[PDB]
């Protein structure tokens, strides 16, 4: 009906936005070790 009772409210809402970021890195920041490769045969959907 529109009769305002003796009570108040506070609302909360959460949104999200896609943004563009920016990265900076030093010279000697990470050490990288790469390995070797291994093959695996397996029955595929039609072949291997």
Contacts with a second copy by CB under 8 A lie at: 40-41, 43, 46
If the CB atoms of residues 13 and 41 are measured against a second copy, the closer one turns out to be: 41
Q: Which residues contact 22 (CB under 8 A, 6 or more apart)?
A: none
Structure tokens at 14: 């959460």
Q: Quick check: 32 and 26 in contact, CB under 8 A?
A: no
Q: What's the min distance (Å) between Cβ of 36 and a second copy? A: 15
Q: What's the min distance (Å) between Cβ of 34 and a second copy? A: 22
Q: What's the min distance (Å) between Cβ of 47 and a second copy? A: 10
Other beta carbons within 10 Å of 22: 4
């Amino acid at each position: 009906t529109g009769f305002h009772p003796g009570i108040a409210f506070t609302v909360v809402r959460q949104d999200r936005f896609a943004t563009e970021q920016l990265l900076y890195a030093e010279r000697a920041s990470e050490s990288y070790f790469v390995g070797q490769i291994q093959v695996h045969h397996h029955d595929a959907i039609g072949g291997v």
